[PDB]
């Protein structure tokens, strides 16, 4: 149907990709198919190669303290393209079957089986001053013309196409995010029951979250305010699991619960980008360009993080806080902070056609 053709600065090297959005089925990934149109009698008899980088422009340190763009290629694959490989007995896919016949004998395919336990493209939100090369995992299909793998990869003919290993929400939700916490405040009375729960395990981007804050404060202390906050657990695995929790939506209503009384009010709230545009370092869905993308979908993989060596594992949970009055003597300076954490996956629904249609000025 439609293909994506990028050309080198000279024009001799051209790469025809099928789709720049590859779904991760956790167990398996969509192979990166495509063809490369290379001039036989005009490339000065130089073999051309295809390189799938998985650049991770992140890691430890912050604000350029001791680290600046520490690119770590989590997975790089190089396949010979101009030579028709050594006994290439592999399927050509329907994408390269029609493309090869259309362009002729000067177009040679290349396939990139992406590893299963490898991160999804999640570009960290750049700061207002920050621009250009952002952070986070970013895949790239890079076809260059080099006699050997180490030939400086001449920039004139080093075509690179940016792709994503996007992931979409499962079509089968299971349990309910029900989890309760109890605390014997000052060991006075029976512990308060904060039996908060959500409405649905999987929340699509923009859909509401129904936080059903249920409180039975039996202790003498009464809550000054109840805050329900949705947090984005960006667990950057480049370091020793340097998890960076970040709240993306807050609902702190001054509704107060009396001692020896019950309370139950659904704290409907929704995470979006307008209120979180200021928060730099936020994990966003992978960007092929400076386009605006949603918050990073909850990253999932086969058996969870079965072999997650490194990469941003974005996960979401809501924080059902309960700001109570100070235990015993209250000096208006301290407050007990009973809270409950409820997990949920904020992943896009499964699309049918090409993912993005957003208007591009």
């Amino acid at each position, epitope marked *: 149907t439609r293909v994506f053709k990028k050309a080198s600065p000279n024009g001799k090297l051209t790469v025809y990709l099928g789709k720049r959005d590859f779904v991760d089925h956790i167990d398996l990934v969509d192979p990166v198919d495509g063809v490369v149109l290379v001039d036989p009698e005009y490339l000065k008899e130089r073999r051309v190669y295809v390189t799938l980088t998985c650049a991770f422009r992140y890691g430890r340190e912050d604000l350029d303290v001791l680290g600046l763009t520490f690119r770590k290629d989590l997975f790089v694959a190089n396949v010979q393209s101009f030579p028709p490989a050594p006994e290439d007995k592999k399927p050509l896919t329907r994408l390269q079957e029609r493309l090869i016949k259309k362009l002729g004998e000067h177009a040679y395919p290349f396939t990139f089986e992406i590893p299963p336990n490898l991160p999804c493209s999640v570009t960290l939100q750049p700061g207002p001053e920050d621009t250009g090369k952002a952070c986070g995992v970013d895949y790239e299909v890079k076809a260059f013309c080099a006699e050997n793998l180490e030939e400086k990869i001449h920039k004139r003919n080093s075509v690179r196409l940016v792709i994503r290993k996007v992931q979409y929400a499962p079509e089968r939700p299971g349990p309910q995010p029900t989890a309760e916490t109890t605390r014997q405040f000052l060991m006075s009375d029976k512990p308060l029951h904060l039996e908060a729960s959500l409405d649905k395990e999987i929340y699509y981007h*923009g859909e*509401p979250i129904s936080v059903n804050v249920h409180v039975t404060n039996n202790t003498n202390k009464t809550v000054k305010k109840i805050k329900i906050s949705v947090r984005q657990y960006a667990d950057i695995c480049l370091f020793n699991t340097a998890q960076y929790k970040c709240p993306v939506a807050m609902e702190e209503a001054d509704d107060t619960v009396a001692p020896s009384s019950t309370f139950c009010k659904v704290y409907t709230l929704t995470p979006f980008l*307008a209120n979180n545009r200021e928060k730099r370092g936020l994990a966003l869905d992978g960007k092929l360009k400076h386009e605006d993308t*949603n918050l990073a979908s909850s990253t999932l993989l086969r058996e969870g993080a079965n072999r997650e060596i490194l990469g941003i594992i974005v996960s979401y949970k809501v924080k059902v806080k309960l700001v109570v009055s100070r235990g015993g003597l209250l000096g208006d300076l301290a407050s007990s902070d009973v809270a409950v954490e409820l997990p949920f996956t904020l992943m896009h629904p499964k699309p049918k056609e090409e993912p993005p*249609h957003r*208007e591009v*000025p």
Partner: antibody
Amino acid sequence: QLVESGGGLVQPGGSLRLSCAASGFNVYSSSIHWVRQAPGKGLEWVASISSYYGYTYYADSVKGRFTISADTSKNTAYLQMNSLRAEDTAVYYCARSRQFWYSGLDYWGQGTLVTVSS
Amino acid sequence: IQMTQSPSSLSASVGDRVTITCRASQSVSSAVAWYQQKPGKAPKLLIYSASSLYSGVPSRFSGSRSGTDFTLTISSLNPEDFATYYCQQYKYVPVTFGQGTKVEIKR
């Protein structure tokens, strides 16, 4: 299901306020678009309040005349037709394109005609 | 962008093929949608992505795809299909609609 109101007569240079009562939809998961149709003429885009990326696009004709907002608590995308010229008389429609995967303007409002004359 | 529908008026009765070609001023890729508007009613989405047919509409409508031209074939042309059709692009912020193609019974 979308419902709109606010049509009537405005003097040349006056101001009118139109709103959409988006029912069953969300203002964050679905951008709200206001579409103009002159009587006997083709459709013409006016404004679009994404309300997720916080961007409110505008037509070249009505650039700063409009101030479209979005009251998410009431699930409305309020629009302000201000400085209505005589040639701004039309029927104004409300459309709800998906915030992600645009896929056209599927849900449409009834339409509130805004006649501007002295 | 200036998307224009060459068949401004289609005087075709039921059972006659009705191809409404809409050619954009410049390449709008595959971001074109088609709406059907009855006389004095609200437009109804028919197809999106210039090929994908919207859920809940008859399969008589089928959109073509080209460099800048986006035809819409109907063929059956039921009485419900006798309305005005608009081609709209969403590949750029100034979303541009088509002029409109009124379809009337041939007499």
